[PDB]
Symmetry: C4
Subunit: 68 residues, 4 copies
């Protein structure tokens, strides 16, 4: 017996918890001396790049414009 | 031929394994000297924040109250 | 227009790529001196714990026994 | 009331954001002195291995050949 609702709940918990955790992990590592002043890994630069990536994919599937 | 059941199994394995791994990664990094006494990255603070985030999203889709 | 097949493909790529990457990240961090001989974060211990977690969830949804 | 479209949007955002973040985390850690010249964790080697893994799973579900 496969419970799609319970599957959905587990799927959601894992991905939401992972993202919240990964956001903190990224923050911690952005502060490691071994990458200080390395532009690719400057927090603000990384956050912007991540933002673009999420936007680009979200726009393929759930565009802000609902009538292209 | 697309096997939804096998897709579901792979999806679940990846997300469950990732979350279990990320929980350990977070724990390890919380202990790095470069963030000791940095309040945003104190383990107990991070765990609480993650808890709130998971709860907030779980409540949108699978509320404890099944009759809002 | 929402393309479920393209959604499925993106979902799968992200989660598979993330898991493969997280497995490497875990390996790297397991080797950081700041957690050497800390039993919770010894690689073999972590891998076992992750294995149990994945098994426990996989068994809820896709049991090895297809007739419980 | 369960909104599959909103669920799909949250699922996608989490997994896309996580992957983008994990790619950066991997890059940062590949540069940590404690794994320099450790072949398993050399960035180019890791990227190749990840590529193979993603390809192998993508080929099971969405083969380049649509007529095997």
């Amino acid at each position: 017996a496969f419970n799609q609702t319970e599957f959905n709940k587990l799927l959601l918990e894992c991905v939401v918890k992972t993202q919240s955790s990964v956001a903190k992990i990224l923050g911690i590592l952005s502060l490691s001396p071994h990458v200080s002043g390395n532009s690719k890994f400057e927090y603000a630069n990384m956050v912007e790049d991540i933002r673009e990536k999420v936007s680009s994919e979200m726009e393929r599937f759930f565009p802000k414009n609902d009538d292209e």
